[PDB]
Design a protein around this ligand. Structure first.
Ligand SMILES: *CC(=O)Nc1ccc(NC(=O)C*)cc1
Lengths: 16, 504
């Protein structure tokens, strides 16, 4: 929540 | 009659020199008299002075034809060379009639082939510029001689390649490639372009002239020497042709060429395809549509230890598995084409660092597909990626091996482990290898990219309370709270993520 959906958005940026 | 015949050419009035020219020409077609023409320097000189000064086209054709017949023997060859001949026939490469043009280029060709010091002489006279300007002619035999002349001079001479480039060399040589079918002319032209392709200044000029597509037309020719010279030239230019359009036919042939029995053909094909798929989304699709994933996997299975083949093929697989539409399907296709076991195996020796670095990046992109998590695990990818990570990190602590950046392995290994940690089973293996101390020590790295993959794999591991406590036990809270205010947003997001999952 809030901080976690931040992480998944930056994860797609790093590789996908 | 040789002693008297020099005066009739060193004299005014057309017919006197014309007749003499149309009289020394005949004394050249006969061996007994011709042996006496080369024997006399006053003769040889006089024909050179007449040829480059004449106004009548029959004198020009008869003189240039006389020296051409002289150029069939050693003593006549150096007679041309000694009597200042080369500057004259270089001048005659600008004649408007084709007879003297033919005679001059064949005489210069014989001199370039059999006369010592003629390559330096032709170069100085401005021959290279004249030869390039003649490349717009239409006689393929004339073009074959002219391009072989250029190859004789450009081979191993940097100054020569530059002059050819300044004269519009590449475009004229590319035009020949995409117009004619005479094998000898195509093979000779390809030799010139191969020599020019090793020069960084000729590389974009050949590419901008459409030389990549032009060489692709002859990849299926029955001449083995022509296809391999075409392939070698394409390999050289490949890194400077990542923007060209109209690559559909070339890419299609290269994919088919990967199944070749010839070792050099396969190596060149993988090498060109690797460079051509680097940061070109359009090329990545086309290769996938023609079943390139299958072809490159089979190519890797066939190479085994041949790293000159596996390194470019795995590079191309790395390109085709990320940052384009069909990348998801290309990630599955590597598994569906039985490629996963070979990819992991290539992480282990006797693979060297170039191959390893390319394989890690592929595994990184392969791990994006959750259907690849288990089959990568059962191949032993996790303990090997950690083994490489530990060794690479141990080397950066000494306060560039085999050409690879040693911290690029730290970023690549940790990044691949970050992706694999998305799966819970993979997390068990990562955690069971004692890697949390290493992942916390990487937070203190100054390279922002290493800090990002380290906090990333720490974030996935922290889904489990037991792992989050161990991470906290290694004093990760302090560097993570500092990384909260990192200039890199991806690290701040990751650092905030690991601290959040430390809720207990
Ligand atoms: C908090 C948050 O939303 N962070 C965030 C969102 C998106 C990205 N995207 C990229 O980096 C492309 C990063 C961080």
């Amino acid at each position: 929540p809030a901080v976690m959906e931040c992480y998944e958005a930056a994860f797609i940026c790093h590789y996908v | 009659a040789i002693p008297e015949l020099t005066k009739l050419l060193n004299d005014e009035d057309q017919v006197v020199v014309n007749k003499a020219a149309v009289m020394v020409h005949q004394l050249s077609k006969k061996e007994a008299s011709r042996h006496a023409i080369m024997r006399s320097p006053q003769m040889v000189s006089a024909i050179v002075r007449t040829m480059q000064n004449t106004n009548d086209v029959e004198t020009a054709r008869c003189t240039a034809g006389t020296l051409h017949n002289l150029s069939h023997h050693r003593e006549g060859l150096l007679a041309i060379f000694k009597s200042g001949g080369i500057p004259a026939l270089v001048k005659m490469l600008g004649s408007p009639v084709d007879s003297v043009l033919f005679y001059a280029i064949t005489t210069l060709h014989n001199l370039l082939l059999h006369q010592e010091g003629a390559k330096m002489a032709v170069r100085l006279a401005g021959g290279l510029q004249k030869m390039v300007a003649l490349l717009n002619k239409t006689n393929v035999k004339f073009l074959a001689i002219t391009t072989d002349c250029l190859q004789i001079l450009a081979y191993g001479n940097q100054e020569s390649k530059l002059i050819i480039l300044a004269s519009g060399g590449p475009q004229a040589l590319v035009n020949i490639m995409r117009t004619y079918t005479y094998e000898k002319l195509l093979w000779t032209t390809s030799r010139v372009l191969k020599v020019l392709s090793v020069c960084s200044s000729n590389k974009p000029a050949i590419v901008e002239a459409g030389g990549m597509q032009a060489l692709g037309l002859h990849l299926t020719d029955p001449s083995q020497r022509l296809v391999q010279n075409c392939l070698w030239t394409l390999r050289n230019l490949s890194d400077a042709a990542t923007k060209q359009e109209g690559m559909e036919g070339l890419l299609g042939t290269l994919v088919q060429l990967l199944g070749s029995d010839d070792i050099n053909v396969v190596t060149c094909a993988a090498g060109i395809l690797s460079n051509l798929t680097c940061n070109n989304y359009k090329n990545k699709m086309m290769v996938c549509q023609v079943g390139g994933i299958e072809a490159l996997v089979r190519t890797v299975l066939r190479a085994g230890d041949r790293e000159d083949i596996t390194e470019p093929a795995i590079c191309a697989l790395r390109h085709l598995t990320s940052r384009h539409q069909e990348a998801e399907m290309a990630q599955n296709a590597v598994r569906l084409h039985y490629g996963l076991p070979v990819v992991v195996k290539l992480l282990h020796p006797p693979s060297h660092w170039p191959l390893i670095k390319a394989t890690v990046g592929l595994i990184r992109n392969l791990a994006l597909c959750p259907a690849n998590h288990a089959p990568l695990r059962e191949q032993g990818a996790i303990p090997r990626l950690v083994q490489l990570l530990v060794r690479a990190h141990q080397d950066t602590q000494r306060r560039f091996v085999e050409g690879v950046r040693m911290e690029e392995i730290v970023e690549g290994c940790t990044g691949a482990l970050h992706i694999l940690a998305r799966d819970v089973h993979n997390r068990i293996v990562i955690r069971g290898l004692n890697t949390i101390p290493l992942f916390v020590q990487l937070l203190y790295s100054p390279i922002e990219n290493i800090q990002r993959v380290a906090a990333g794999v720490l974030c996935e591991l922290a889904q489990d309370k037991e792992a989050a406590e161990a991470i906290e036990a290694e004093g990760a809270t302090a560097p993570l709270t500092e990384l909260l205010h990192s200039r890199n947003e991806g690290v701040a997001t990751y650092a905030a993520a690991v601290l959040f999952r430390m809720s207990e």
